Amino acid sequence: DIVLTQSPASLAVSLGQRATISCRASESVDSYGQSYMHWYQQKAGQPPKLLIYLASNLESGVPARFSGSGSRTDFTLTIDPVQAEDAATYYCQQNAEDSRTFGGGTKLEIKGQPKAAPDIQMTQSPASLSVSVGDTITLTCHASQNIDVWLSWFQQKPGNIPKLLIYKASNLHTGVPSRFSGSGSGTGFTLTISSLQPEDIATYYCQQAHSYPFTFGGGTKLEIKTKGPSRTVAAPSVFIFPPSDEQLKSGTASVVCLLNNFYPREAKVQWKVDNALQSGNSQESVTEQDSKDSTYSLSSTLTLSKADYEKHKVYACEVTHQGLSSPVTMSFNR
Amino acid sequence: AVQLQQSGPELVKPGASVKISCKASGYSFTSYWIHWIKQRPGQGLEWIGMIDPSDGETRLNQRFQGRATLTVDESTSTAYMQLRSPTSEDSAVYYCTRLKEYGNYDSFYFDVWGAGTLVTVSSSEVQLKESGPGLVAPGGSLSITCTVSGFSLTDSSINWVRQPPGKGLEWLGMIWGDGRIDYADALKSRLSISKDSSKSQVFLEMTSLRTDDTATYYCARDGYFPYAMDFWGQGTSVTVSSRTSATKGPSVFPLAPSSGTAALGCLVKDYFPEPVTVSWNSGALTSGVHTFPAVLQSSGLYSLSSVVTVPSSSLGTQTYICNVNHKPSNTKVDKKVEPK
Amino acid sequence: TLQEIIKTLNSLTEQKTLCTELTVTDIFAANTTEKETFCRAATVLRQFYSHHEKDTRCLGATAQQFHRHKQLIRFLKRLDRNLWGLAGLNSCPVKEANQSTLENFLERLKTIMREKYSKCSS
């Protein structure tokens, strides 16, 4: 088998200099006067990306500073001038023989550089907040590093562009109403909207100007408090499901009760086993108030061992709701 | 008064470059730096870089590894941003803004903004997506599926390459056009490669596992001559360890319809961690569907039910299948819920 | 010309920044002709803008410092042009080690030009 060996194994090169990587095949990679030796570029957590095919032919997108040379056994890949984005691991690959092989690889690193100062992370809280016209609201912004008083606030109305409100943590931009107010120095900062107006329902971002790269918070979305999804009265359609024979092999037994599409929310569900009311062995789950009809749905799961399930016969689910004239019972016999 | 007029929306193919303008007016263009900001829905606002229209000096966020190029034409008062090698990740609304300053940078802020420019970067036609487990006990068996898209399996050849973490690529084998299969001499004994052209799926089956098998597993399509690996999947990380899992796959039970509305469902029980995804008839059935929030049990595991209300007449005629996918265990099962 | 250097120095205090803390030979600390003084001033500023345009101690670390550094260099290059325009020749020795912060040397110089400007006005 053709064994591809690569030299060097690790390579520390200065930004703007020349990087040259060798590859040695154990047998000839040439066939019909064509060298089946390819070069790939792989970055961390990323799949390999084909750089050069047939010893020197560059792929559609690969910059000109990347080049290859050689035939038969000795191959070369060169980068000049090496860029910052070129810090990656490169591989040579032969497809000359039937069973393809890869070189060990070469890690191109960069030296003599001012290391890497971390970005200032901006955190906003809360992520969102329900509000009404007249309210006094205070949004928070935090810097993972001292930013002095270098902090701006922007408002972004849905589908619209960012608008500056405050600059230098507390200075109001010309034209911005006085009901907007800012505070903070160092790492803790705040925005206050006094007597919140309909216009003020937006997403708010903070941005630090202490250091490059400039960084923004994730935002705080203001949402209007609604008069509620006003609906009539809808009784639940209720269904009971026995434990499937498939589950019975496993050693457990689950009885499900569905209360489908009801309004209002308020509803009592009760499990009755051989006309005996149960407690603590059940869990209710409820869906979000429906987009279309403004109703809810509920599931109640009665959980007990296969043994306790076998000894009893009638399994029932009793449901109380405003929309029902008297409680509904859905039952089954095992 | 002061304005910044940006160029129109762009629809780009991957690898194809894109160039947007930002035309300044109403002030001495050369007096302030122009900055470019990226906005994606998931993320928020990201600073790309800046350019000085007085001299063409440019400063860019390291995150745009010579991806973004900033230029000016002071003759037309225009700022430009060229994005090279754009990918799906580059799809966003790109704003240009001016950093107004007073008292020689005593105060400096983004007072005026352009309307933004939508840059849509099209999804690559050729797609390869790997699927396999995470944790596998030593002495086990790992099976992986590559799911080819935008090309036919009957013409193209797929390779299986593996990369141990912090180590180099190792070719496992390939499956031709065609039918022809080639394996690695050091792995031929326990390697099995197959394909199902009808569902555009390529498989891998490595029997008798050992901790050495701990690697990211890739599938890579062969391009036209010399037949190098031009397209790769993102890879699937596989850990061979006696380590106690950590994550549990769910068991999906039928909630069979009763003997004129009818209800049926699936009981997704004992799964860890969250979240689980449920669809009905591969996304066709949406009306009357209710997927309930999960419940943390006494066992420390999670349970949830998914239901659908259908007309009683459709029962026995219409087939009802629920599609459950628990990603942090690679569990993906479809259960048929039919009358009894 | 002298009216022009006064105009450049009108905006001097706005330029008193991070980099103005570094040293410069105070060619006012050690009496020569006016053309000799301008020549020695114009020399020291040139020496400074060319030795600190890419100096880490001048650029600072904050965004404000990045911008203020750039503007300082622009201010000094400008000032130097005004000064050479009044210096005559380019040959004068800097035969003194007497250091001064750049801030001090600029204030010293501003006072000197203001005296000269108020001496040529009736």
Q: Round to whole Å and give the CA distance between A323 and A263.
A: 8
Residue with tokens 């904050």: C62
CATH architecture of A228-334: Sandwich (2.60)
Q: Tell me the chain A residues in contact with residue C66 when contact means C-beta distances shorter than 8 Å.
A: 212
Q: B232 and B292: one domain? A: no
**Technique that determined the structure:** X-ray
C-alpha distances in Å from residue B338, one per residue of A23, A33, B142, B231: 62, 64, 33, 42
Q: Which two tokens stand for residue B267?
A: 């009981």
Resolution of the model in angstroms: 2.5
Same domain, B143 and B219: yes
Separation of alpha carbons B253 and B308, rounded Å: 15
**Per-position b or e across B294-323, b if 16+ CB within 10 A of its CB:** bbeeeeebbbbbbbbbbeeeebeeeebbbb
Query: DSSP letters of A308-319?
Result: HHHH--EEEEEE
Which residue range is the domain that position B147 belongs to?
A: 126-244
Q: Distance, in angstroms, between A164 CA and closest chain C CA?
A: 19
For C64, the closest chain A residue by CA position comes to A210
Residue numbers in C near A210 (CB within 8 A): 62-63
Residues of C within 8 A of B108 (CB-CB) are 63-64, 67
CATH superfamily of A1-115: Immunoglobulins (2.60.40.10)
Question: Which residues of chain A make contact with B111, given a CB cutoff of 8 A?
Answer: 164, 173
Q: How far is CA A209 from CA A206, A221, B54, B256, in A?
A: 10, 22, 21, 61
Q: How far is B161 from chain A (nearest CA, A)?
A: 10
Same domain, B54 and B165: no
In chain B, residues with a C-beta closer than 8 Å to the C-beta of C11 are 104
Q: Which residues of chain C have a CB within 8 Å of the CB of B104? A: 11, 14-15, 17, 67-68, 71
Calculate helix-pair angle for C102-119, C34-52, nearest 10 degrees: 150
Residue where a domain terminates, one of B125, B155, B175 = B125
Q: Based on the fold, state whether residues B117 and B176 are members of the same structural domain.
A: no
- Disruptive mutation site among B30, B58, B104 for chain C (greatest number of C CBs within 10 Å): B104
Looking at the structure, tell me whether residues B284 and B219 fall in a common domain: no
Q: What ranges do the domains of chain C cover?
A: 1-122
B327 interfacial to chain A (CB closer than 8 Å): no
Which of B125, B159, B186 terminates a domain? The answer is B125
Pairwise CA distance, residues B257 & B253, whole Å: 13
Chain C residue with Cα closest to B102: C14
Residues contacting B23, CB < 8 A, separation 6+: B4, B5, B6, B76, B77, B78, B79
Spatial CA neighbour of B204 closest among B148, B152, B258, B142: B142
Residue A77's contacts (CB-CB under 8 Å, 6 or more residues apart) are A20, A21, A23, A39, A51, A52, A66, A67, A68, A90, A92
Q: List the beta bridge partners of residue A263.
A: A234
User: From the centroid of its chain, how far is CA B176?
Assistant: 27
* DSSP assignment string, B99-167: EEEETTTTEEEEEEE---EEEEEPPPSSEEEEE--SEE-TT-EEEEEEEEESS-TTT--EEEEEE-TTS
Instruction: Specify the CATH class of C1-122 in words.
Output: mainly alpha
The answer on B271 and B170 residing in a single domain is no
Choose among A310, A278, A303: nearest CA to B299. A303
Instruction: Report the C-alpha gap between C9 and B85 in whole angstroms.
Output: 49
Contacts of residue A285, Cβ cutoff 8 Å, sequence gap at least 6: A298, A299, A301, B292, B293, B294, B295, B304, B305
Show residues of chain C in contact with B101, CB under 8 Å. Answer: 67
At which residue do the structure tokens 């003194």 appear?
C96
Put simply, the answer to whether C62 touches A150 (Cβ < 8 Å) is: yes
Cα B298 to Cα A248: distance, rounded to the nearest angstrom: 19
The residue written with tokens 């803390």 in the block is C21
Size of interface B-C (CB pairs under 8 A): 17
- Measuring CA to CA, how many Å separate B173 from each of A27, A317, B220, B226, C44? 20, 58, 10, 17, 71
- Domains of chain A, by residue range, sit at 1-115, 116-227, 228-334
Quote the number of domains for chain B: 3
Two tokens, residue B139: 């002495």
* DSSP 8-state assignment for residue A35: B
Q: How close B35 comes to chain C (CA, Å)?
A: 13
B143, B105: one domain = no
The full DSSP string for C29-54 is T----HHHHHHHHHHHHHHHHHHHTT
Residue at which a domain ends, from B203, B220, B244: B244
Residue with tokens 């020695």: C40
For residues B139 and B115, membership in a common domain is answered with no
Contact call for C62 and A210, based on CB within 8 A:
yes
**Total Cβ atoms within 10 A of residue B256:** 18
Of the partner residues C14, C63, C70, the one whose CB lies closest to the CB of residue B103:
C14
CATH for A116-227 is: 2.60.40.10
User: Which chains, if any, share at least 3 CB pairs under 8 A with chain A?
Assistant: B, C
Is the Cβ pair B108, C64 closer than 8 Å?
Answer: yes
Q: Are residues B13 and B25 in the same domain?
A: yes
Q: Residue C2 belongs to what H/E stretch?
A: helix C2-9
Verify whether the Cβ–Cβ distance A211 to C62 is below 8 Å: yes
Contact B295, B251 (CB under 8 A): no
Distances (CA, A) of A201 to A169, A222, A268, B77, C108: 21, 5, 38, 35, 56
DSSP C73-111: HHHHHHHHHHHHHHH-SS--------EEEHHHHHHHHHH
Q: Which of B240, B212, B236 is nearest to B144 (CA)?
A: B236
Does residue B66 sit at the A interface (CB-CB below 8 Å)?
yes
Using an 8 Å CB-CB cutoff, list chain C residues near B105.
64, 67-68, 71
Q: How far apart are CA B100 and CA B120, in angstroms?
A: 30
Among residues C85, C13, C2, the alpha carbon closest in space to that of C45 is found at: C85
Which sign, positive or negative, has the C-alpha torsion A179, A180, A184, A187? positive
Among B108, B226, B251, beta carbon nearest to A209: B108
Domain identity same for B254 and B323: yes
Please tell me the distance in Å from C9's CA to the nearest CA on chain A. Answer: 28
Cα distance from A27 to chain C (closest Cα, Å)? 52
Q: What is the DSSP string of A85-134?
A: GG-SEEEEEE-SSSS-EE---EEEEEESS---PPPPPEEEE-SEEEE-TT
Nearest residue to A317 via CA among A303, A306, A296, A332: A332
**How far apart are the C-alpha atoms of C19 and C39, rounded to whole Å?**
23
B253, B340: one domain? yes
